[PDB]
């Protein structure tokens, strides 16, 4: 993806 | 010696069950105010969440929902909460199940045993200034394993909108899969959880929960303690590799644990092989 | 005479609402689902966009004349104790805009009465002639918030085909609340031609003008034990009077068999 | 008017 994402 | 100052009595402005003070004993940064505190998720464009009450799966318990016949429990194999509202010892902390709490369609009472997250924050927390990770959140009391801490609250947005957000420090994906997937962005609108730092040695875990609706696109993210937490300890979760793969080019992890996997040193060793 | 239910709301209100019957053998009514907030059974898409909210910039308690949320109803209509002002228009009430999640003020500001829920002690009881009713278990000063008319939100067209039209409340293209299948304590509040409460349109967390929330406030001081009631209005009685007539028993009653009969003698 | 009875403000 293009942006950082926190995720479980 | 710089004094520790109380710089906000309650960052939640009365919206949580308890006050959440902010202190700073480290530098001159005043109480962060570049965001709107909200206690429940908000929307800034139409999400068309399914709120049809007749679509809810619900229980027929004339009990406190502690029997193996509670349907809401069975939608996660069993109710995962013990009599004090804590996740069972046996709760899978590696790959947590989806939790279905009781809702307005259930026959049970509002104080049934399957309503922990919807009852809100009970533990005493504090926003504080850390040495190296800006603001953080810590416990002002001991917190046993399995206790509900708080929810990751923010602005619900689509995957595509999350892809063009400038600041990607506060984006939390609701689903790791392809396609029609949504995110919580706590940049502009969020609660205390937006200040919770990444730790490579985490003490809280995020769990997907359903309460008043059961639209599977929009689970609510609930943090529970993954072990006993001592008074004064900083709270933190593992943000995951979908964060660090992007963010490690801009900064590295300052958590300081011996197990840290995202420090300059850890990354440098891995570049070597 | 007998307490037949400790809390008809099953813990969903701030306080318990007991049910008693000293009149007949009818048990606690249970042919509806008690809910404390309005529910939907079809797509309404209530506008919940937080950027659409008009909101204030107050960092006081919202008691000043500069609160915008107050100005959207000309002024805030609440006094320091959460009661409507003496001067509040009880005949044609204005729309009330409470403070919301976009306001800079604290959750305990003075412009948040309805959203704080029921504070008065109420009781569901069996009446002599109007089935179940609701009464006060304490004195209640004029202007005090009592409870909200909560139910299932439906379109005008759906309300037109509902078989049971005893619990339909028009909001104002109009929508309605039907408290037949889903409702709260307010569904038990009877019509009185001598009313002591009045319904007011209120906006709290959203400002979708299709969907005002209906709040009941006392229209005078109410004594302990008095039955609560409001004037249902002529959009109810024009249809309903063909099936039954008003049993309120007041000398001012305008919808009894006798009152209606006397008016037909307009000849 | 309308087919069904409606309480109103
Ligand atoms: C969700 S925010 C947490 C609150 C943030 N500390 C603040 O002052 O608002 C995420 C950001 O905080 C910082 N951060 C969180 N955990 C970190 C860590 N383990 N090491 C370095 N920086 C961290 C980074 O700026 C990260 O993008
Ligand atoms: C909103 S409900 C009130 C609760 C109702 N009494 C009950 O036992 O469920 C409306 C219905 O209650 C009865 N009712 C309310 N006010 C009345 C009055 N003043 N005279 C006769 N019947 C009344 C009628 O059956 C009316 O259609
Ligand atoms: Zn149950
Ligand atoms: Zn249930
Ligand atoms: Zn339950
Ligand atoms: Zn680390
Ligand atoms: Zn204000
Ligand atoms: Zn206010
Ligand atoms: Zn306001
Ligand atoms: Zn009458």
Q: How many domains does chain B have?
A: 1
Nearest to D9 among C166, C199, C240 (CB): C199
DSSP B245: H
Question: Got the DSSP string for chain C?
Answer: -EEEES-TTTT-SSS---EEESSSS-----SSEE-SS-EESS------BGGG------SS-S-STT-HHHHTTSS--B-TTS-B-TT--SSSPPPEE---TTSSS-TT-SS-TGGG---S-EEEEE-SSSSEEEEESS-B-TT-EEEEE-EEEEEHHHHTT-S--SSEEEE---EEEEEEEEE-GGGGPEE-SS-SEEEEEEESS---TT--EEEEEESS-B-TTPBPEE---HHHHHHHTTT-------TT-SSSHHHHHHHH---
For residue B76, how many other CB atoms are within 10 A of its CB?
Answer: 18
Q: For atom 26 of ligand 2, which residue has the closest CA?
A: C166
Chain C residues whose CB is inside 8 A of the B43 CB are 48-50
Could you say which residues from 138 to 167 on chain B have a Cβ atom under 8 Å away from some Cβ of chain A? 162-165
Q: Which residue is associated with the tokens 């889903």?
A: C182
- Helix or strand or coil: residue B211? coil
For residue B260, how many other CB atoms are within 10 A of its CB?
Answer: 19
Q: How was this structure determined?
A: X-ray
Resolution in A: 1.9
Whether D4 and C233 lie within 8 Å, measured CB to CB: no
Instruction: For residue C192, give the CATH number of its domain.
Output: 2.170.270.10
Q: Is C204 annotated as a binding residue?
A: no
Q: Which domain holds residue B156?
A: 1-273
- Helix or strand or coil: residue B13? coil
Q: Which residue is associated with the tokens 């900083």?
A: B234
Tokens for B97, please give them.
């199940």
Q: Which protein residues have their CB within 5 A of the ion that is ligand 9?
A: C 56, 69, 99, 103
Q: Are C140 and C120 in contact (CB under 8 A)?
A: yes
Q: For atom 26 of ligand 1, which residue has the closest CA?
A: B169
**Cα C125 → chain centroid:** 18
Chain D residues whose CB is inside 8 A of the C159 CB are 2, 4, 6
Q: Is C193 annotated as a binding residue?
A: yes
Q: Is B112 annotated as a binding residue?
A: yes
Residue B106 near ligand 1, beta carbon < 6 Å: no
Question: Which of B166, B169, B188, B236, when mutated, tests ligand 1's pocket best, judged by the most ligand atoms within 8 Å of its CB?
Answer: B169
The dihedral sign for the CA sequence B237, B240, B246, B249:
positive
Which of B157, B160, B168, B176 to substitute to test the interface with A, most A CBs within 10 Å?
B168
Residue C189, burial from CB neighbour count under 10 angstroms (0-12, 13-18, 19+)? buried
Phi, psi angles (nearest 5°) of residue C262 = -60, -35
Q: Beta partners for C96?
A: C202
- Helix or strand or coil: residue B172? strand
How near does any CA of chain D get to the CA of C253, in Å? 17
Q: C132-136 and C19-21 as β-strands: parallel, antiparallel, unpaired? A: unpaired
Q: Are C259 and C227 in contact (CB under 8 A)?
A: no
The dihedral sign for the CA sequence C141, C142, C144, C148:
positive
DSSP A6: B
Whether C232 and D1 lie within 8 Å, measured CB to CB: no
Whether B242 and A2 lie within 8 Å, measured CB to CB: no
**Cα B271 → chain centroid:** 32
Q: Which residue is associated with the tokens 């995720």?
A: A7
Q: Which of C14, C244, C223 is nearest to C137 (CA)?
A: C223
Q: Are C134 and C125 in contact (CB under 8 A)?
A: yes
Chain B residues whose CB is inside 8 A of the A7 CB are 172-173, 176, 239-240, 242-243
């Amino acid at each position: 993806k293009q942006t950082a994402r926190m995720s479980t | 010696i710089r004094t520790e100052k109380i710089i906000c009595r309650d960052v939640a402005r009365g919206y949580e069950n308890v006050p959440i003070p902010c202190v700073n004993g480290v530098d001159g940064e005043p109480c962060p105010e570049d965001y709107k505190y909200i206690s429940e998720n908000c929307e800034t464009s139409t999400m068309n969440i399914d709120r049809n009450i007749t679509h809810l799966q619900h229980c027929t318990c004339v009990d406190d929902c502690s029997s193996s016949n509670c349907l809401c429990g069975q939608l996660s194999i069993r109710c995962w909460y013990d009599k004090d509202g804590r996740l069972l010892q046996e709760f899978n902390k590696i790959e947590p199940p989806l939790i279905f709490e009781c809702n307005q369609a259930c026959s049970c009472w509002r104080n049934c045993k399957n309503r922990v997250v919807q009852s809100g924050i009970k533990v005493r927390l504090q926003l504080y200034r850390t040495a190296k990770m800006g603001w953080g959140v810590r416990a002002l009391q001991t917190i046993p394993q399995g206790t509900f801490i708080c929810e990751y609250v923010g602005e619900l947005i689509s995957d595509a909108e999350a892809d063009v957000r400038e600041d990607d420090s506060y984006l939390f994906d609701l689903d790791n899969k392809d396609g029609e997937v949504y995110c919580i962005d706590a940049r502009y609108y969020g609660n205390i959880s937006r200040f919770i730092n990444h730790l490579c040695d985490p003490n809280i875990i995020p769990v997907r929960v359903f309460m008043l609706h059961q639209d599977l696109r929009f689970p609510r993210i609930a943090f529970f303690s993954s072990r006993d937490i001592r008074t004064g300890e900083e709270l933190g979760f593992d943000y995951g590799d979908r964060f660090w793969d992007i963010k490690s080019k801009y900064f590295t992890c300052q958590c300081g644990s011996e197990k840290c996997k995202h420090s300059a040193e850890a990354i440098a060793l891995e570049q070597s092989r």
